Amino acid sequence: VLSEGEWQLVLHVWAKVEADVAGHGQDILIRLFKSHPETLEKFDRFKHLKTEAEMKASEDLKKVGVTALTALGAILKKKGHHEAELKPLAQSHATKHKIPIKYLEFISEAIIHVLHSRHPGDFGADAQGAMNKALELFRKDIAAKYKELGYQGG
């Protein structure tokens, strides 16, 4: 789907994420909750975290962020060959957590924002476009899996 050069840009910036998965995951979740506060309602154990500093101090939140970014990294490394990795994620996020596709758009925005904030010299326009395409492919394929399970994801 993406060109080889596009995948290389995606995986180059992902290697920078991997130097500090925990910190990237914290910043991505905090940015998501600040930009789109409705998303915080999906995390029952985070509702007592009232400030950014409380969110950064929560080992629970940090672990959730690492788990999410670890799954996303494993998907990105498949360079589109990710049906086997997406099926359980779709099942879980559609049927258990009830995450609309729009919320996956929101977290994608947060991912792009944090990656550019931390790695501008390794995440210029071409790399941003490549990452946007990779996350778009992720969302398109997961939306198809949602439907297969009986969830439109709207």
Distance of closest approach, residue 53 Cβ to ligand HEM, in angstroms = 21
3 binds ligand HEM (CB under 6 A): no
46 binds ligand HEM (CB under 6 A): no
Nearer to ligand HEM, 27 or 121 (CB): 27
66 binds ligand HEM (CB under 6 A): no
103 binds ligand HEM (CB under 6 A): yes
- Contact criterion met (CB below 8 Å) for 153 and 97: no
Distance of closest approach, residue 109 Cβ to ligand HEM, in angstroms = 10
Residues within window 15-44 making contact with ligand HEM, judged by CB under 6 A: 39, 42-43
Provide the 10 A C-beta neighbour count for residue 93.
22
Q: Can you tell me which residue has the tokens 């492919």?
A: 137
- Contact criterion met (CB below 8 Å) for 111 and 10: no
**DSSP assigned state of 149:** T
Helix axes 101-118, 4-17, angle to 10 degrees: 70
64 binds ligand HEM (CB under 6 A): yes
Q: Where are the alpha helices (DSSP H) in 78-124?
A: 83-91, 101-118
Which residues form the interface with ligand HEM (CB under 6 A)?
Answer: 39, 42-43, 64, 67-68, 71-72, 92-93, 97, 99, 103-104, 107
